[PDB]
Amino acid sequence: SHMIEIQASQRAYILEEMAVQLKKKAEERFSHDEYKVGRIKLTAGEKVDSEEDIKTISVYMAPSSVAPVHIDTDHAYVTKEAAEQKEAKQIQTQLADIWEIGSEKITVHMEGGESVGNE
């Protein structure tokens, strides 16, 4: 049903090791929570020797729980967005702290919602 493909790569192996250890450590703070860490996507460049070499980290946060026509006051609408922006940025900082890695490298995708983190 669910089949994957990989290309042999030392460099990728290391990167997948850093990735499961990062996944686990996140799952510790978001186990019993609103949000569940789901996909995590790392990118890296020519050399892959430590965490330092990770260029980016995408995180897809899970719901852990149709109306075409919505109608809103102007005020309802902007504040509804403000809060979702503000939720997204908090998972960003939380993971920044947890992983001891600058939030510039972390994109948070808020699936089960409509938001994203920085770039």
Closest of 69, 60, 68 to residue 42, by C-alpha? 60
Closest of 99, 31, 22, 119 to residue 108, by C-alpha? 119
Amino acid residing at 109: H
**Six token digits for residue 6:** 């990989």
The range of the structural domain enclosing residue 50 comes to 1-119
**Sheet-wide strand order for 106-109:** 36-44, 54-62, 106-109
CB-CB contact of 35 with 62 (8 Å): yes
The count of domains in the chain is 1
| Alpha-helix residue ranges (DSSP H) falling in the chain | 10-29, 74-99
Residues 17 and 22: their CA atoms lie apart, in Å, by: 8
Resolution in Å, one decimal, please. Answer: 2.7
CB-CB contact of 57 with 106 (8 Å): yes
Backbone angles phi, psi at 88, to 5 degrees: -50, -50
Residues 94 and 34: their CA atoms lie apart, in Å, by: 14
63: CB partners within 8 A, 6+ apart = 35, 36, 111, 112, 113
